[PDB]
Amino acid sequence: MVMSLLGHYNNFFFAAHLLDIAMGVKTLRTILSSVTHNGKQLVMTVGLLAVVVYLYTVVAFNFFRKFYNKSEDEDEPDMKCDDMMTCYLFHMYVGVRAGGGIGDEIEDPAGDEYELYRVVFDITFFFFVIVILLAIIQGLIIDAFGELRDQQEQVKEDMETKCFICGIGSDYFDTTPHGFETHTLEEHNLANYMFFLMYLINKDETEHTGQESYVWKMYQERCWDFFPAGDCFRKQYEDQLS
Amino acid sequence: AESILEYFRPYLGRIEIMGASRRIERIYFEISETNRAQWEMPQVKESKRQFIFDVVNEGGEAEKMELFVSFCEDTIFEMQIAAQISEFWGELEVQRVKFLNYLSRNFYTLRFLALFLAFAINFILLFYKVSDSPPNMVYYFLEESTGYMEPALWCLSLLHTLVAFLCIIGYNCLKVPLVIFKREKELARKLEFDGLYITEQPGDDDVKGQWDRLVLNTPSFPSNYWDKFVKRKVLDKHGDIFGRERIAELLGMDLASLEITAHNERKDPPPGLLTWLMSIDVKYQIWKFGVIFTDNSFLYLGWYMVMSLLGHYNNFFFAAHLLDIAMGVKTLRTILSSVTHNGKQLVMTVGLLAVVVYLYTVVAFNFFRKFYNKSEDEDEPDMKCDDMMTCYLFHMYVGVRAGGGIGDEIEDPAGDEYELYRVVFDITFFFFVIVILLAIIQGLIIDAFGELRDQQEQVKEDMETKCFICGIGSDYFDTTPHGFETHTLEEHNLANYMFFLMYLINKDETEHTGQESYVWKMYQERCWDFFPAGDCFRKQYEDQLS
Numbered sequence: 001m002v003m004s005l006l007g008h009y010n011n012f013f014f015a016a017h018l019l020d021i022a023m024g025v026k027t028l029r030t031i032l033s034s035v036t037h038n039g040k041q042l043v044m045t046v047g048l049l050a051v052v053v054y055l056y057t058v059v060a061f062n063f064f065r066k067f068y069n070k071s072e073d074e075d076e077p078d079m080k081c082d083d084m085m086t087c088y089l090f091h092m093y094v095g096v097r098a099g100g101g102i103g104d105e106i107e108d109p110a111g112d113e114y115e116l117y118r119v120v121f122d123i124t125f126f127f128f129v130i131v132i133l134l135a136i137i138q139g140l141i142i143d144a145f146g147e148l149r150d151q152q153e154q155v156k157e158d159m160e161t162k163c164f165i166c167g168i169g170s171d172y173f174d175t176t177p178h179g180f181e182t183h184t185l186e187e188h189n190l191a192n193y194m195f196f197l198m199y200l201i202n203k204d205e206t207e208h209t210g211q212e213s214y215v216w217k218m219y220q221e222r223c224w225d226f227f228p229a230g231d232c233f234r235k236q237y238e239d240q241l242s
Numbered sequence: 243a244e245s246i247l248e249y250f251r252p253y254l255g256r257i258e259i260m261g262a263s264r265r266i267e268r269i270y271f272e273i274s275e276t277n278r279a280q281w282e283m284p285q286v287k288e289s290k291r292q293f294i295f296d297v298v299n300e301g302g303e304a305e306k307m308e309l310f311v312s313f314c315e316d317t318i319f320e321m322q323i324a325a326q327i328s329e330f331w332g333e334l335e336v337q338r339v340k341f342l343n344y345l346s347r348n349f350y351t352l353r354f355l356a357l358f359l360a361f362a363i364n365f366i367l368l369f370y371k372v373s374d375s376p377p378n379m380v381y382y383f384l385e386e387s388t389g390y391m392e393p394a395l396w397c398l399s400l401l402h403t404l405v406a407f408l409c410i411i412g413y414n415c416l417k418v419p420l421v422i423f424k425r426e427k428e429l430a431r432k433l434e435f436d437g438l439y440i441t442e443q444p445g446d447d448d449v450k451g452q453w454d455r456l457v458l459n460t461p462s463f464p465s466n467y468w469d470k471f472v473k474r475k476v477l478d479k480h481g482d483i484f485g486r487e488r489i490a491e492l493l494g495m496d497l498a499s500l501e502i503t504a505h506n507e508r509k510d511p512p513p514g515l516l517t518w519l520m521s522i523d524v525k526y527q528i529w530k531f532g533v534i535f536t537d538n539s540f541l542y543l544g545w546y547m548v549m550s551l552l553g554h555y556n557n558f559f560f561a562a563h564l565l566d567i568a569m570g571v572k573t574l575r576t577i578l579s580s581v582t583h584n585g586k587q588l589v590m591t592v593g594l595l596a597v598v599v600y601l602y603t604v605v606a607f608n609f610f611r612k613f614y615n616k617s618e619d620e621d622e623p624d625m626k627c628d629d630m631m632t633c634y635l636f637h638m639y640v641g642v643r644a645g646g647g648i649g650d651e652i653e654d655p656a657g658d659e660y661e662l663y664r665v666v667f668d669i670t671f672f673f674f675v676i677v678i679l680l681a682i683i684q685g686l687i688i689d690a691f692g693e694l695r696d697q698q699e700q701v702k703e704d705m706e707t708k709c710f711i712c713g714i715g716s717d718y719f720d721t722t723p724h725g726f727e728t729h730t731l732e733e734h735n736l737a738n739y740m741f742f743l744m745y746l747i748n749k750d751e752t753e754h755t756g757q758e759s760y761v762w763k764m765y766q767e768r769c770w771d772f773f774p775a776g777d778c779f780r781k782q783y784e785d786q787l788s
Contacts, residue, residue, distance in 0.1 A: 040573070041573050041576075041577060044571070044573050044574065044577070045577065048567070048574065048577075051564060051565075051567060054364075054561070054564070055561065055562075055564070055565075058558055058561045061370075062558060065372060081372075082371060082372060083369070083370070083371045083384065084367070084368045084369060084370055084371070085368060085369070088368070099645055100643055100644070100645045101643055103639075103643065119635070119639055122639065122643075123638075123639065123643075126643050127592075131680065131683055132581065132683070132687075135683065135684045135687050136577065136580070136581070136687065138684065138688075139580070139684075139687050139688050139690075139691045140691070142688050142691075143688070143691045143692050143695060146692070147695070167720050169717075225723075229723045229724070230720065230721065230722065230723050
């Protein structure tokens with residue numbers, strides 16, 4: 001509402017309703033739920049990266065200050081490691097985004113002193129905040145898809161073994177041909193129970209039959225002992241005539 | 243009799259055992275008035291949850307009961323230690339403990355304060371600035387004016403160190419007794435039931451076992467353990483088959499071999515407060531310190547100590563306590579355990595990469611030497627493939643990090659000779675140490691997450707089919723409505739067994755009932771045949787009346 005109204009003024013603002021796509025086009029909702037399923041532990045990785053880069057900055061500032069000169073034309077008037085805010089921002093903005101580690105933007109360490117300390121600093125930075133810390137992001141998505149896809153299998157499998165009202169497994173019902181198929185469609189249909197409460201509520205209390213009032217009595221009392229929960233009327237009378 | 247049942251219901255325990263009749267019997271008892279209240283504490287619920295998890299997957303079936311009883315005993319000492327801290331020359335001693343019990347009470351909030359202070363000092367540390375002029379180079383502390391910026395840092399630095407000092411003493415007063423009791427319990431069994439120091443000996447390995455030899459002969463060996471007869475109990479058992487005096491001299495009890503039986507003479511020490519207080523076991527204390535200086539958590543706490551102390555000097559050093567995040571903020575511990583779960587086989591891939599790049603270097607040095615010139619301005623005075631160390635380092639430092647293979651930094655092979663040998667060298671390098679060898683790193687993480695997530699499902703699923711005490715499946719119990727639900731809450735509750743050992747230990751041996759002594763007899767004997775393990779008292783009497 002508000003964005004449409006705020007239209008007729010800077011018409012560009014209309015280009016925010018396009019994000020309605022999500023709540024539409026079903027497919028997406030599933031795709032976006034995949035990434036959303038691990039949101040609580042996704043931004044925390046970003047915080048971890050923000051901590052690690054700070055840890056690297058405190059070292060680069062103390063020892064590698066004279067390396068970050070931008071090497072302007074025939075002059076060296078600019079240096080990034082003079083303060084903390086103006087240097088840590090450099091690592092945060094170019095370092096993690098370098099695609100190859102911070103060693104690309106700094107002056108090449110062809111000198112003698114600190115030749116190995118700088119190489120280790122480069123290599124560890126490449127191995128920690130480029131290969132590893134950008135792999136956990138992908139990991140929290142690969143299995144995120146797997147979980148949304150796996151949970152469907154369980155709800156598919158459980159409906160093929162239990163009647164969801166009785167606890168009886170499918171085998172026992174499969175003693176007769178298509179016994180389990182009939183059990184989930186004639187006896188415990190999960191839809192007649194839908195159609196029973198409507199019959200109870202609409203009917204006036206005066207004309208309740210012998211049984212319909214009694215189940216109504218517990219329904220008013222809010223007790224659920226009238227559901228079968230264990231027996232199925234043929235496990236009950238199997239011995240006599242079945 | 244309805245109200246009398248309802249009022250007393252939350253205290254009437256119910257345990258179900260077998261024995262002395264080859265059938266299953268049921269025992270009732272009075273649980274508690276305060277232990278039932280405490281049992282629902284987050285540190286205890288999480289401990290139980292963690293214990294359950296490492297039994298279903300890393301737990302052998304045969305010894306499942308044994309370690310469960312071990313955790314059962316551990317929780318009792320946790321109860322005893324936690325029940326205490328809850329609330330001018332000789333009167334200071336009581337006020338000292340009256341404050342120590344407060345320090346150990348709110349240990350976790352005090353610990354979290356240390357992380358918060360570390361976060362604040364790190365944030366304020368974000369304004370330093372090098373300057374070649376005194377306000378040699380000086381680390382001048384720039385600020386958005388606001389003169390109150392430098393004074394605050396000093397007070398915060400002092401307070402952080404103070405809180406870090408307090409948490410160490412809190413740890414000592416809170417956790418150390420648990421580890422000590424653990425070690426005492428583990429050691430006392432290897433003598434009574436094994437010959438780890440009598441018949442067998444450590445095989446020059448197991449420094450943990452070697453270090454324990456300095457505690458055997460101390461006058462006070464079982465300082466935190468309950469059973470104080472651990473010396474006499476093993477004395478008789480191993481005093482006949484072996485030298486009785488030989489076993490006697492090993493465990494100490496100087497002249498107690500005769501004092502054990504000849505105790506006709508009676509036992510008054512003079513009041514020597516602060517006069518003879520230096521009569522302490524110099525051999526037991528060194529053993530305790532040797533144990534305490536090995537625990538990982540205490541060592542990490544001392545490391546956090548050392549860095550805070552090394553503060554007030556190069557204040558930047560404070561920016562290492564920030565890595566406390568890990569041991570905090572739970573979430574992370576799981577995320578970091580994901581990558582840590584495959585550490586043994588992760589660095590080995592790095593070693594493999596280090597080998598493969600060396601293999602490539604030996605070829606590039608022998609044939610492609612004249613290609614690595616850096617092509618300086620109007621001159622070619624620099625070449626990287628002149629030695630091995632100065633060339634292999636080039637591949638290690640730029641090659642694997644090139645993001646596109648080594649072919650980017652070398653001079654373009656537009657020449658005729660070796661045109662294909664160089665192209666193959668480039669392409670294989672791209673296909674082996676960039677696409678493949680940097681994909682195994684991601685693979686060892688993708689399934690690493692899957693395994694930590696999958697192991698949870700198994701411990702969730704097993705608890706929904708078996709009673710964890712009886713081997714009976716859920717189906718059989720589901721014959722009656724909610725039968726399995728009641729079986730895991732009335733009969734085999736896994737928490738009445740908690741409440742039964744406390745009832746046994748606290749009760750004196752004289753008033754043990756007919757059954758309570760017999761299960762006590764095996765518990766002293768350390769036999770676990772009184773657990774049901776197969777029957778459930780309704781599979782037992784289903785035919786008669788059920």
